[PDB]
Amino acid sequence: RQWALEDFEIGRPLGKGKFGNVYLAREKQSKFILALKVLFKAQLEKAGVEHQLRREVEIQSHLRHPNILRLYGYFHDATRVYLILEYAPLGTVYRELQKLSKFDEQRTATYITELANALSYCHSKRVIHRDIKPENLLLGSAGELKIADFGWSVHACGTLDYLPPEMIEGRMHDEKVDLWSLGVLCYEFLVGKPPFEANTYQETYKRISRVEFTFPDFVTEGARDLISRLLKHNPSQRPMLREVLEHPWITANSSKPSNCQ
Numbered sequence: 077r078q079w080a081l082e083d084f085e086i087g088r089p090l091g092k093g094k095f096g097n098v099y100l101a102r103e104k105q106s107k108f109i110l111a112l113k114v115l116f117k118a119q120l121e122k123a124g125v126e127h128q129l130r131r132e133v134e135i136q137s138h139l140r141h142p143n144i145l146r147l148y149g150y151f152h153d154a155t156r157v158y159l160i161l162e163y164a165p166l167g168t169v170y171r172e173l174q175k176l177s178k179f180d181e182q183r184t185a186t187y188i189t190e191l192a193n194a195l196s197y198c199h200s201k202r203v204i205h206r207d208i209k210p211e212n213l214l215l216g217s218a219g220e221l222k223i224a225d226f227g228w229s230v231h232a233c234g235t236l237d238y239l240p241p242e243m244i245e246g247r248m249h250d251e252k253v254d255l256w257s258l259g260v261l262c263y264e265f266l267v268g269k270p271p272f273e274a275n276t277y278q279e280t281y282k283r284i285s286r287v288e289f290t291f292p293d294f295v296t297e298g299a300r301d302l303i304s305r306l307l308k309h310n311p312s313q314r315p316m317l318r319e320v321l322e323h324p325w326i327t328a329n330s331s332k333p334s335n336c337q
């Protein structure tokens with residue numbers, strides 16, 4: 077399809093990022109509600125990321141999963157690039173965390189199950205995720221989690237909070253990156269901040285490289301066990317997604333079945 081900007085009525089700004097603004101929008105003919113992400117070419121080219129976006133968009137076009145945000149299409153004019161995206165009405169996990177301070181074990185294990193399901197589906201088709209931040213997790217009409225960043229690779233910053241040691245130490249990274257991501261998110265969901273949070277990039281780099289973190293008292297033995305298994309310095313020592321999905325703390329607390337499958 078040949079989409080142009082006049083094909084859509086543009087509504088309220090949903091959010092802003094470094095490169096793009098996201099707007100609620102509705103396709104004029106069908107009245108289909110969606111989100112339009114608007115990115116400036118000149119800015120993308122200046123940062124050296126236009127190709128990276130192109131590759132991520134191509135990867136994203138292949139992913140069809142209830143817990144992955146859908147890319148409907150794209151287009152451009154002289155100035156900018158427009159991504160036609162699924163509208164996730166309940167907004168970001170980042171914002172939900174800010175409002176609730178921390179999540180209970182049931183919400184947390186349901187979210188981790190949903191992420192593990194989405195990542196399992198991605199791994200099955202040779203697709204790996206880079207780091208996963210709560211700002212880049214959206215919530216659908218029924219509160220289902222949607223991975224919304226296009227941060228994929230067949231094989232292809234920044235705050236360091238969500239990056240694994242092998243990505244910051246200049247090492248080799250594989251499908252085990254997104255296992256680390258699960259460990260960071262599991263901890264952040266339960267505690268209200270990520271495990272290596274610090275005042276400086278420099279303090280954070282060191283905490284990540286050393287895997288230097290501690291649990292507050294309220295974190296239960298089951299959650300500690302899962303988080304400690306995922307946050308291993310050596311990628312090869314991290315579990316398979318199957319193991320995450322079968323973990324007794326996950327199975328006892330999740331509201332959602334662990335569709336591996």
Ligand SMILES: COc1ccc(/C=N/Nc2[nH]nc(C)c2C(=O)Nc2cccc(NC(C)=O)c2)cc1
Nearest residue numbers: 090091092098111161162163164165166167168171
């Ligand atoms: C109360 O403020 C909001 C409530 C809900 C939203 C939902 N946005 N949902 C989206 N659907 N599809 C896409 C793409 C988006 C999106 O990127 N939203 C977005 C982006 C950046 C920041 C936020 N902020 C919040 C608070 O949700 C939302 C956005 C703002």
